[PDB]
Subunit: 409 residues, 2 copies
Amino acid sequence: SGIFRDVSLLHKPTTQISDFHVATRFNDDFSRAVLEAEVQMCGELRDYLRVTVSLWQGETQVASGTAPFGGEIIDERGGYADRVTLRLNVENPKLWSAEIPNLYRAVVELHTADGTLIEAEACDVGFREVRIENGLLLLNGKPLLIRGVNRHEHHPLHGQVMDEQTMVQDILLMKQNNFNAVRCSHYPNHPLWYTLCDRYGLYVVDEANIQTHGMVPMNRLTDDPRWLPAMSERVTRMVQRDRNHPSVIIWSLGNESGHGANHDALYRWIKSVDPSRPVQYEGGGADTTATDIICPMYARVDEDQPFPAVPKWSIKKWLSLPGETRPLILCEYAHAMGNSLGGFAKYWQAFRQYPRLQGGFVWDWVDQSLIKYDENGNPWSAYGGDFGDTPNDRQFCMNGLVFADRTPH
Amino acid sequence: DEANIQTHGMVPMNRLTDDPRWLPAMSERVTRMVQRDRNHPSVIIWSLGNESGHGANHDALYRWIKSVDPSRPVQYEGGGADTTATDIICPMYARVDEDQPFPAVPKWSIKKWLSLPGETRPLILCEYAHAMGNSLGGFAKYWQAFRQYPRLQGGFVWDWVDQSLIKYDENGNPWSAYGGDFGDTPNDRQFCMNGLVFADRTPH
Ligand code: NA
Ligand code: NA
Ligand code: NA
Ligand code: NA
């Protein structure tokens, strides 16, 4: 507990940019793109107010557009007087991917007609399309093979406080070991994480801070309409924050909270506000109406585990169940606890052979051990139960591919 | 129930079946079969023939049966076992786990075949487990997969009975004869004997 992320002060003008959304649409062979930027304002509307959106490739301006406020008519009562949408044509765009993280810079200027700047906001833009077609997750028209890992925010000394150096160290080690994807298990991350994933090139699953694993049954809160407000906030405010990051390719509704009606509602909310990213969620059997991707945890390659209500089928078998058409990407697989990763090769042989088996996220990146000091003041790695907490679950917090200090297993 | 159409020797295999000038002759082999056997409850599936590639004539005759008799699925293996002329993915000698990616007409692993992008059909092998001589090694592997995968709904072994004929030597004692023993040339050795039983119905 505590104040474990940054505290800051921000000064905005009274007349201000209050929100902006960046979209990139493409023609059939990705040789032409349109950058669409919706900008919202707060404060007093004046006829002399303007928004300029410029796009930059390094130091070279590729496009620019200016418009006064006033959106298109949307219903009987007119449109948004406090909004404007700018559209910029981009020929032969340099496309973003984990392989080549090509980035542009979009600059949003709020100003007056005479050219006096009020304020500016900006973001990194990655020209990429994410879609599921014919049962395959495609990035820029090509089927992904997810070499992923789950990564909690953990430091052996500072706990759940994250820093740039630790983040960069993780990304370098991940990419040096042929990972191209990360799952934010199980919450929105420190804001810098996404910036670094944009720039270094990693596919991100951004996950709402909703886990109710201790509930009996697991969906007791998530099927309760009285908990829909609280859950909606955890999903909506995540999307509102992170929607402009190119590295985020998939939204997740949370983790291990069963499957409730609130999941279906919030699944639809995201599909409505952001059609650019698939939505996934594992709860309630990994293949519910709240997920675009079959995303089981610890389903085996060839071996069925036919649990009541929530079976974990063989991943090869799961794909071809009567009526099933979706891609399968394990949200968690290959539990890396201690001397482990036995049978890891069996997954990858299956991933390569089966088009619709598109990889998964290893559990997990780093051991969640903390440093304690003995009678002599010497450091040692401590797990659950070493701090005096009871009931505890012993060494079950250490399931990482790297030690807490980032030394490889 | 399978139409009397096989053009396996053609190069390519669909040379006749894609030729509209052969549609009349092909149509009669399909239509007159349906007209004869359509009241038999034992017949659950119509087949358009065997090893004749995939031509436009198959598509037309597929549709003819569907219009005339909606009560039975239509299958056909030619042209890669999953063409627009078949309701059932019906390969011959597709293996359980091992892909055989031949150009144009691959024989995928049957488990893999089911979940190819956009694929939804049942898979039943029109021919599998070639029982030529000392054979049927790996038969258990098919049956384990059939039982595990709902949409793997079995197959038809090749085949029932050795196609050997009775010849008599100098003493008048009978012996089982195959291709080449009747002076026939060119012949293909003992490839006519792929049966689970001998010609006299004694089990292998
Ligand atoms: Na794959
Ligand atoms: Na754990
Ligand atoms: Na079956
Ligand atoms: Na034969």
